[PDB]
Design a protein around this ligand. Structure first.
Ligand SMILES: CCCCCCCCCCCCCCCCCC(=O)OC[C@H](CO[C@@H]1O[C@H](CO[C@H]2O[C@H](CO)[C@H](O)[C@H](O)[C@H]2O)[C@H](O)[C@H](O)[C@H]1O)OC(=O)CCCCCCCCCCCCCCCCC
Ligand code: CLA
Ligand code: CLA
Ligand code: CLA
Ligand code: CLA
Ligand code: CLA
Ligand SMILES: CCCCCCCCCCCCCCCC(=O)OC[C@H](CO[C@@H]1O[C@H](CS(=O)(=O)O)[C@@H](O)[C@H](O)[C@H]1O)OC(=O)CCCCCCCCCCCCCCC
Ligand SMILES: CCCCCCCCCCCCCCCC(=O)OC[C@H](COP(=O)(O)OC[C@@H](O)CO)OC(=O)CCCCCCCCCCCCCCC
Ligand SMILES: CC1=C(/C=C/C(C)=C/C=C/C(C)=C/C=C/C=C(C)/C=C/C=C(C)/C=C/C2=C(C)CCCC2(C)C)C(C)(C)CCC1
Ligand SMILES: CC1=C(/C=C/C(C)=C/C=C/C(C)=C/C=C/C=C(C)/C=C/C=C(C)/C=C/C2=C(C)CCCC2(C)C)C(C)(C)CCC1
Ligand SMILES: CCCCCCCCCCCCCCCCCC(=O)O
Ligand SMILES: CCCCCCCCCCCCCCCCCC(=O)O
Ligand SMILES: CCCCCCCCCCCCCCCCCC(=O)O
Ligand SMILES: [Fe+2]
Lengths: 36, 115, 65, 32, 505, 37, 341, 34, 38, 34, 30, 82, 33
């Protein structure tokens, strides 16, 4: 029903996006597409 | 320049030197202005779609509204009931105040960014 | 209304307003002809498009000989 | 024929303006 | 009162005045046809179908009369150049006159039907109400359309009893009106085969007769009658508009791409003939042929008909116009007078060079001369200081074979550049710019103007289809939704099936 | 034969007059440059 | 009560996502068009059709990825998977630009599906179908730009490619080649889009600052009930305000909301017409009077002549790389260039 | 009393499943060297 | 006579018939199972 | 080739683990639906 | 003539502004 | 109102939901990863690897130039790499 | 400037014809009331 508090789920999904998005920005400076 | 072609000259020179098309604040401006036009059309079509029958076929429906009447002139639940089903229920406003505030905020904020 | 000679002749042609066949009637047969016509427009389109290439069908001005 | 080019506009307005005047007056007479 | 955008709805329940209006519209369209032809006759120069054909002169309805066999004037000329002919009554003038007389007669019939609107024919014999049995009318009219369509194909196009239609060779050199026999095989669907046009109208005509007979005898199913509101004349307007914009998109495409019914001698070349160098290949093919059998360069190129050379020139490309560049193509580059000849460029080392041709996309194009392999060997430079390839440095000359400058060679760099600036347009012509006070700027042909108008009208009629379609299916709520619609019917969950009150939970 | 029952009065209010006149005058202002070319 | 009515029952059930008969056409086509775009921009190159990289896999970012158009040599081929060009080879299909037509065509039928959906839901719910009518303007824009415009040109190659930067190039192309900013049909589209956004913002702002005090809190949103009969803001005060600020004001709520439909829908329809002209190169490129004077009079200069110089720069400098099938070789000396730059 | 598999269920996983697959593919891509 | 592209035409015509027919078979089945109550 | 099972294996085991954990509750759904 | 035409139209628009503001149909309540 | 489906807020906070999805979501992420790391994505879609855009001493685009020979043209380019 | 000579009549009729139409409709509306 509500065993996992919703704010927990929102916080943990939160950095999940921050990690993936931040990974994509690091990748703009490394490897393919970095101009280097 | 204060002129029609002068405006276009400004734009072309600006793109060559600032690559404004590739600037996020211009892209938000386009989103503010495309979305503004979109939501203008949406809101106008949803209200027009749910006008309450007040007139005959031989007269403009506009005469169904009298300036300063207290009752609303359309059915917002019918509009919500149509739009909530066109997408899904919670992607629709049933609060007129939240809706009209949304209408104000989207193009204003987008044009702030492009300015 | 005014009666005329030509009116009286044409009369039965405008006399069955509202008459329907019951239920679905010829709807399945109509559906068959619609299907055939779609396939047939597809072929005509894809011939013009050069997506369907047929022997001895040269889709070019050089088909005027 | 090497005619006057403003001849066309002069003739056209010469017909158009007074005719429109009369049409306006006639139609609003009819609807009252 | 009625708003201005609804004045014509007073005809919805008045079949007699509806007929009066339709007659008036038909009178107007036919009158236009007659007026348009007279204006075109009064401005058409018939004296050179080679370098001043009808499509260079801004002629619009002339090619449609010519397409179905009207080719001559009471004045003695024909558009094929034949002179001393007697067209009979069905000259351009006679066709124009017939449309004006038809216009006058339709006008009078419209008056009669407008006054005597209350004909008993229009009343339903059971209810005394005006009513039009639209299902049966469809069958009557469809049967008629099929008779006409079949006869058009069986008699007019075949020559059985009629003139035939315009046909030509693939390079538009020798066109004329000929009877055409049906093509019954699969090449009858080839848009470039005229026999398919004949077979289409015969077979479709027979299908139309059979379908017409069906729709006169067989009533519509109740399901379909209800679904399509077949008691409402506006449903017919909705579907009719849809069919009309369908037909409008098709005629625009075939005009633009070309088909047996849009021949280039009536409408001008297409842009794709420029894109694919269609005439330039054929010209080269003939010059090689003349050369292999031992003709000199001057002889090989002099054998090139000017008419073919005139097609290999971008000024006749319909995709070189502009929206507000008005009038005939002659008003732009001028009235073509003569082919100047084929320009051959050579550098100081005797290598033949080739001007890069202007693509239709470009209002302006640089002058770039390449060798047979595609390597740049000369150009006209913009910045001069570091110029490597100037005509002066590379010694470029121009020699002409065939045409008006045949056997002439030019070596002074300004003159040679002048022809190189023209060579980007294809073959080089002498134009009369004085007579029309031509401004020098390319205009589109009737093929372009026709395509533009009909592509635009089609798109606009799609909206008419949407509007009148919506009006038919939502007639009950045109003036507004029900003021007693209750919130349970539009809120979620109350009914199992949306809108169906019998599915309550 | 009776007069036609389908006739109706037609209307254009003052505000629609102002709207339409504005539409026509601005459309003319826009296209006139192109007509003169 | 046959199978058709049983199916109608099921398609029209009130569920979280309404299906309807229109769903049969809408949902596969919308999903496939969306799926093709995400697939192409993640994995598919444009090397063989354009000489461009265009996927995440190749090193592109969200702004430069595209599903690019097929090569100019495909003409207007439908590029069916099973057609004569790819011959059922999926890999070749992707490399030849087949995902472009896939997205364009499936997208077109999805747009039909969605507009039918607006019709279907409106009929069942009982409202007038003006939202479907308004959506005719997006449809006209899509077909005129994505389908009609390349059909008039030599091939699909010159249609827009489905990507952010690729659409930017499309903009700049239309400036340099069509002088599209000079086109009165585009200007009417501009006035319609900017007119809508203005109307949008001024209508929302007005309502929010003519609200009636119907609750007690500093949040005015809670003081609205969607079933109340009363208008939630004063039209009378709004009319006075704008009459005294601007001279004129709306007085009829129905006209106002119709006008909001009218302005951006009309604007979009107008720009579509101008694009149809551009399919034929029927540009509003020049003013002949300006050019006659300028040719004869080298001291005559306007913003009009200044912008054509810019167009000529755009054409010569992007053409070789933007139309690689033409093998344009422009040596340095032929490139139009002002001083120093 | 709630059903687990619905039309809604199908719509969600029709988007959600390939989205995460694609995200993994795009994350891997950031480590590719030329 | 029966060209590669004509074969591909039938390939595509059949494939689309499969897709539409399969789709409708599935929809008719579900609609029979989960009816509305009246 | 070989890389296809490697890619497909996490999806297949994800599908198996969901099937096993949900199967009891999916049974009641199909049943309550006569 | 084209200058006269452009200024004439513009002046007609300004006069229309005058009438639309000061000679509007007055909005009346209920 | 509501149309009968289980509310999302109820589902994503439920233990059973996260039991199933803590497997399906990483599995899908790993599957996607492997599609790239194995190089299968290159082969499926025809995308050049960083080393196979040009031949060594070449700067010409392998641009498709024929409509019905286009399949063979691409293969001819690819063979000018093996 | 060497402008198109028919641009003047084009523009004049383009303004005059639809404006006159509206004025006719408005005035006969006013004499109704
Ligand atoms: C609104 C509601 C929305 C509804 C949504 C609809 C979604 C689906 C729409 C279907 C898409 C249809 C596109 C058909 C492709 C096309 O046209 O394909 C084009 C082909 C013609 O092929 C082209 O033909 C050209 C000219 O060829 C000719 O010229 C050459 C050189 O002279 C040679 O002689 C050659 O052999 C000869 O064929 C070039 O060869 C091009 O490369 C080749 O692509 O026509 C054909 O398939 C068919 C042409 C006739 C049918 C016309 C169709 C109408 C649509 C066109 C409207 C645009 C009108 C132009 C306005 C601008
Ligand atoms: C006595 C009849 C008659 C005849 C013989 C002609 C003959 C001619 N007319 Mg005129 N015309 C007529 C009546 C006639 N007209 C009337 C009544 C009008 C007013 C509407 C006009 C208006 C008119 C115009 C405006 C023009 C002509 C033009 C022409 C010329 C070219 C015709 C052409 O290209 O058709 C074109 C053919 C078609 C449009 C046929 C398309 C019809 C669609 C495809 C049918 C739709 C299908 C059907 C409903 C259902 C399918 C049935 C199927 C199952 C069988 C030709 C000299 C042209 C010209 O040169 O004038 C100077 C021209 O521009 N005519
Ligand atoms: C299908 C329609 C059609 C087509 C394709 C043609 C095609 C042609 N005609 Mg013909 N013509 C037609 C109908 C047509 N005509 C009609 C109906 C008439 C009677 C008025 C004429 C009278 C006529 C004459 C008198 C002449 C031609 C000539 C020509 C040629 C040049 C046309 C030109 O320069 O256009 C240029 C066109 C434009 C600049 C049109 C622009 C469109 C405007 C801007 C529309 C306005 C926009 C609108 C207000 C949008 C706002 C709406 C929104 C606010 C709600 C060409 C072959 C000429 C020729 O060479 O003859 C030998 C010539 O002298 N035509
Ligand atoms: C065969 C085609 C056809 C026919 C018979 C009708 C008939 C009708 N329409 Mg429809 N319509 C059509 C095509 C058609 N329409 C198309 C293509 C569109 C998209 C533009 C529309 C969009 C449309 C709308 C939005 C509305 C109608 C309405 C109506 C009704 C009232 C019209 C009226 O009083 O106009 C009066 C119009 C005028 C007095 C002047 C209009 C002048 C325009 C701006 C330019 C003039 C054009 C020129 C003179 C000649 C035409 C050129 C070219 C088309 C050949 C009437 C039943 C109305 C309705 O439903 O009422 C219930 C309505 O609101 N129509
Ligand atoms: C409503 C769903 C829908 C619609 C409208 C389309 C529409 C389209 N698709 Mg898409 N597609 C869909 C669903 C849909 N698709 C689904 C679900 C998938 C995944 C399987 C795909 C996968 C897909 C691919 C992979 C491709 C398309 C393509 C196309 C285009 C060409 C289709 C064609 O030629 O059909 C032809 C077939 C028909 C019109 C079917 C006719 C059926 C009639 C009614 C009956 C005929 C009788 C039958 C043949 C008898 C069998 C005989 C037997 C006993 C021997 C077109 C835009 C192509 C494309 O976009 O190219 C760029 C393409 O390559 N589609
Ligand atoms: C003041 C600046 C300005 C403004 C306001 C406009 C306004 C406009 N321009 Mg112009 N433009 C300008 C400057 C400007 N332009 C300049 C300086 C140039 C340089 C020459 C251009 C070049 C230009 C071009 C080349 C084109 C325009 C077009 C347009 C129109 C776009 C209409 C639209 O919404 O398409 C948006 C697209 C649609 C509405 C199509 C349907 C979209 C569907 C519904 C989307 C559904 C998405 C779906 C839900 C999934 C999405 C998922 C994904 C996002 C992840 C509009 C009238 C276009 C036009 O006129 O076409 C008619 C056009 O082709 N403009
Ligand atoms: C190579 C070809 C590839 C493409 C081919 C595509 C083939 C077509 C597939 C179409 C499938 C879409 C139908 C979805 C139905 C479903 O998943 O179960 C829905 C039902 C589930 O149960 C029920 O759900 C019901 C609610 S609802 O209908 O889901 O909204 C509820 O009433 C009931 O109690 C409950 O038990
Ligand atoms: C900025 C733009 C958005 C405007 C903000 C929204 C204003 C309206 C919200 C009012 C409700 C507020 C109460 C809070 C509630 C709230 O606002 O809504 C969140 C809502 C929560 O609903 P549940 O029933 O899960 O929870 C019960 C709660 O509503 C009780 O508070 O969940 C969703 O709707 C999101 C799921 C969409 C996930 C994908 C679904 C499937 C996708 C469908 C595919 C597309 C459809 C096809 C189209 C063709
Ligand atoms: C009575 C009579 C008669 C007479 C008749 C007549 C004389 C006729 C005429 C007629 C005519 C003479 C007609 C005409 C018409 C015309 C028209 C109808 C036109 C139209 C047009 C339009 C519509 C246009 C439009 C436009 C514009 C303007 C711009 C551009 C665009 C467009 C195109 C849109 C007779 C003796 C025979 C016989 C007896 C009786
Ligand atoms: C094509 C094709 C097909 C299909 C396929 C498909 C259908 C696909 C799908 C796919 C998909 C379905 C995909 C998906 C993906 C997704 C993604 C990739 C996403 C991403 C996202 C993101 C990245 C986000 C983030 C963010 C940010 C950044 C910021 C803000 C916030 C957010 C969170 C939003 C088939 C087989 C039929 C066959 C033919 C071909
Ligand atoms: C946002 C989260 C940080 C994204 C990574 C930023 C680091 C990129 C610069 C770098 O890699 O040196
Ligand atoms: C029935 C037999 C079909 C042939 C009839 C027509 C014969 C001519 C066919 C053709 O044009 O090749
Ligand atoms: C609207 C009906 C059409 C919708 C479905 C049509 C497309 C269905 C998928 C067809 C793809 C399978 C065939 C592709 C591979 C053909 C291989 C070959 O050429 O032999
Ligand atoms: Fe509002």
């Amino acid at each position: 029903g509500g065993r996992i508090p919703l704010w927990i789920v929102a916080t943990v999904a939160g950095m999940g996006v921050i990690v993936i998005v931040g990974l994509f920005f690091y990748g703009a400076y490394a490897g393919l597409g970095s101009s280097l | 320049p204060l002129g029609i072609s002068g405006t276009f000259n400004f734009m072309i020179v600006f793109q060559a030197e600032h690559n404004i098309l590739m600037h996020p604040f211009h892209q938000l401006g386009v989103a503010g202005v495309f979305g503004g036009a979109l939501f203008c059309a949406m809101h106008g079509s949803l209200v027009t779609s749910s006008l309450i029958r007040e007139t005959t076929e031989t007269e403009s429906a506009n005469y169904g509204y009298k300036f300063g009447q207290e009752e609303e002139t359309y059915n917002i639940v019918a509009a919500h009931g149509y739009f909530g089903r066109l997408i899904f229920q919670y992607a629709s406003f049933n609060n007129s105040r939240s809706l009209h505030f949304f209408l104000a905020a989207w193009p204003v904020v987008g044009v702030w960014f492009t300015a | 209304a005014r009666r005329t000679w030509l009116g009286d002749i044409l009369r039965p042609l405008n006399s069955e307003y509202g008459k329907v066949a019951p239920g679905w009637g010829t709807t399945p047969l109509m559906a068959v002809f619609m299907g055939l016509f779609l396939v047939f427009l597809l072929i005509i389109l894809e011939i013009y498009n050069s997506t369907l290439i047929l022997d001895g069908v040269n889709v070019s001005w050089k088909a005027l000989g | 024929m090497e005619v006057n080019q403003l001849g066309l506009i002069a003739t056209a307005l010469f017909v158009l303006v007074p005719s429109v005047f009369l049409i306006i007056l006639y139609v609003q007479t009819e609807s009252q | 009162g009625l708003p201005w955008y609804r004045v014509h709805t007073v005809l919805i329940n008045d079949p007699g005045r509806l007929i009066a209006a339709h007659l008036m519209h038909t009178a107007l369209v036919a009158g236009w046809a007659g007026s348009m032809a007279l204006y075109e006759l009064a401005t058409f120069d018939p004296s050179d179908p080679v370098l001043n054909p009808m499509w260079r002169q801004g002629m619009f309805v002339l090619p449609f009369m010519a397409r179905l066999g009207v080719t001559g004037s009471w004045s003695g000329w024909s558009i094929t150049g034949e002179t001393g002919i007697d067209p009979g009554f069905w000259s351009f003038e006679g066709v124009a006159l017939a449309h004006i007389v038809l216009s006058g007669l339709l006008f009078l019939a419209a008056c009669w039907h407008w006054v005597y609107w209350d004909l008993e024919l229009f009343r339903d014999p059971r209810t005394g109400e005006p009513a039009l049995d639209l299902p049966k009318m469809f069958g009557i009219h469809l049967f008629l359309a099929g008779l006409l369509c079949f006869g058009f194909g069986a008699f007019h196009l075949t020559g059985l009893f009629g003139p035939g239609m315009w046909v030509s060779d693939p390079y538009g050199l020798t066109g004329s009106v000929q009877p055409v026999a049906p093509e019954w095989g699969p090449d009858g669907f080839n848009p470039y085969n005229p026999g398919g046009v004949v077979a289409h109208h015969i077979a479709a005509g027979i299908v139309g007769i059979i379908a017409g007979l069906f729709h006169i005898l067989v009533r519509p199913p109740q399901r379909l009658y209800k679904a399509l509101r077949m008691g409402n004349i506006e449903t017919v307007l909705s579907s009719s508009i849809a069919a009309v914009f369908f037909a409008a998109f098709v005629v625009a495409g075939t005009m633009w791409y070309g088909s047996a019914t849009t021949p280039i001698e009536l409408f001008g070349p297409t842009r794709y003939q420029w894109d694919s160098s269609y005439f330039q290949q054929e010209i080269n093919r003939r010059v090689q042929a003349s050369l292999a059998s031992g003709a000199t360069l001057e002889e090989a190129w002099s054998a090139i008909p000017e008419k073919l050379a005139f097609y290999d020139y971008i000024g006749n490309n319909p995709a070189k116009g502009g929206l507000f560049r008005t009038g005939p193509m002659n008003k732009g580059d001028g009235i073509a007078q003569a082919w100047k000849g084929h320009a051959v460029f050579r550098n100081k080392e005797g290598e033949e060079l080739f001007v890069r041709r202007m693509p239709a996309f470009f209002e302006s194009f640089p002058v770039i001369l390449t060798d047979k392999n595609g390597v740049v060997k000369a150009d006209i430079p913009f910045r001069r200081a570091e110029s490597k390839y100037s005509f002066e440095q590379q010694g470029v000359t121009v020699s002409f074979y065939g045409g008006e400058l045949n056997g002439q060679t030019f070596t002074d760099p300004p003159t040679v550049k002048s022809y190189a600036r023209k060579a980007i347009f294809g073959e080089i012509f002498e134009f009369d710019t004085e007579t029309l006070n031509s401004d020098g700027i390319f205009r589109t042909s009737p093929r372009g103007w026709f395509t533009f108008a009909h592509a635009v009208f089609a798109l606009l009629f799609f909206f008419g289809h949407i509007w009148h379609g919506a009006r038919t299916l939502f007639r009950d709520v045109f003036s507004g939704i029900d003021p007693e619609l209750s919130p349970e019917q539009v809120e979620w969950g109350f009914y199992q099936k949306v809108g169906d009150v019998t599915t309550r939970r | 034969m009776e007069p036609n029952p389908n006739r109706q009065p037609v209307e254009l209010n003052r505000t629609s007059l102002y709207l339409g006149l504005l539409l026509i005058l601005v459309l003319a202002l826009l296209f006139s440059s192109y007509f003169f070319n | 009560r046959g199978w058709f009515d049983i199916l109608d029952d099921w398609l029209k059930r009130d569920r979280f996502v309404f299906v309807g008969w229109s769903g049969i056409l809408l949902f596969p086509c919308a999903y496939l068009a969306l799926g093709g775009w995400l697939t192409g921009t993640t994995f598919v190159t444009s090397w063989y059709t354009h000489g461009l990289a265009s996927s995440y896999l190749e090193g592109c970012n969200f702004l430069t990825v595209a599903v690019s158009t097929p090569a100019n040599s495909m003409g207007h081929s439908l590029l069916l998977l099973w057609g004569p060009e790819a011959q059922g080879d999926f890999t070749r299909w992707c490399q030849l630009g087949g995902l472009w037509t896939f997205i364009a065509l499936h997208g077109a039928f999805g747009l039909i599906g969605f507009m039918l959906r607006q019709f279907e839901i409106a009929r069942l719910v009982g409202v007038r179908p003006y939202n479907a009518i308004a959506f005719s303007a997006p449809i006209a824009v899509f077909v005129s730009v994505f389908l009609i415009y390349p059909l008039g040109q030599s091939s699909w190659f010159f249609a827009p490619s489905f990507g952010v930067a690729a659409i930017f190039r499309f903009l700049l192309f239309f400036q340099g080649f069509h002088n599209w900013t000079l086109n009165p049909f585009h200007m009417m589209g501009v006035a319609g889009v900017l007119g809508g956004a203005l109307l949008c913002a001024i209508h929302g702002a007005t309502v929010e600052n003519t609200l009636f005090q119907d609750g007690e809190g500093a949040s005015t949103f809670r003081a609205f009930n969607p079933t109340q009969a009363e208008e939630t803001y004063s039209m009378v005060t709004a009319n006075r305000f704008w009459s005294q600020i601007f001279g004129i004001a709306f007085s009829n709520k129905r006209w106002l909301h119709f006008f909001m439909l009218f302005v951006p829908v009309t604007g979009l329809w107008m720009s579509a017409i101008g694009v149809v002209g551009l399919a034929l190169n029927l540009r509003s490129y020049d003013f002949i009077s300006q050019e006659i004077r300028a040719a004869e009079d080298p001291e005559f200069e306007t913003f009009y002549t200044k912008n054509l110089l810019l167009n000529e720069g755009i054409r010569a400098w992007m053409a070789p790389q933007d139309q690689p099938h033409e093998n344009f070789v422009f040596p340095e000396e032929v490139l139009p260039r002002g001083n120093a730059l | 009393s709630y059903p687990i598999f619905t039309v809604r269920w199908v719509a969600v996983h029709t988007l959600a499943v390939p989205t995460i697959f694609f995200l993994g593919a795009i994350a891997a891509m950031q480590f590719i060297q030329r | 006579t029966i060209t590669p592209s004509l074969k591909g035409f039938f390939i595509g015509l059949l494939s689309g018939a499969v897709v539409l027919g399969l789709t409708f078979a599935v929809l008719i089945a579900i609609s029979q199972i989960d009816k509305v109550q009246r | 080739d070989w890389r296809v099972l490697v890619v497909l294996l996490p999806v297949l085991l994800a599908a198996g683990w969901a099937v096993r954990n949900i199967l009891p509750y999916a049974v009641k759904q199909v049943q309550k639906l006569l | 003539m084209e200058t006269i035409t452009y200024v004439f139209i513009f002046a007609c628009i300004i006069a229309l502004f005058f009438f639309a503001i000061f000679f509007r149909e007055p909005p009346r309540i209920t | 109102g509501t149309t009968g489906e289980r509310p999302f807020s109820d589902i994503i906070t439920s233990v059973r939901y996260w039991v199933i999805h803590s497997i399906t979501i990483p599995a899908l992420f790993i599957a996607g990863w492997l599609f790239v790391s194995t190089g299968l994505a290159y082969d499926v879609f025809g995308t050049p690897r960083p080393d196979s855009y040009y031949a060594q001493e070449q700067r010409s685009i392998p641009l498709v130039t024929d409509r019905f020979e286009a399949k063979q043209q691409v293969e001819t380019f690819l063979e000018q790499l093996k």
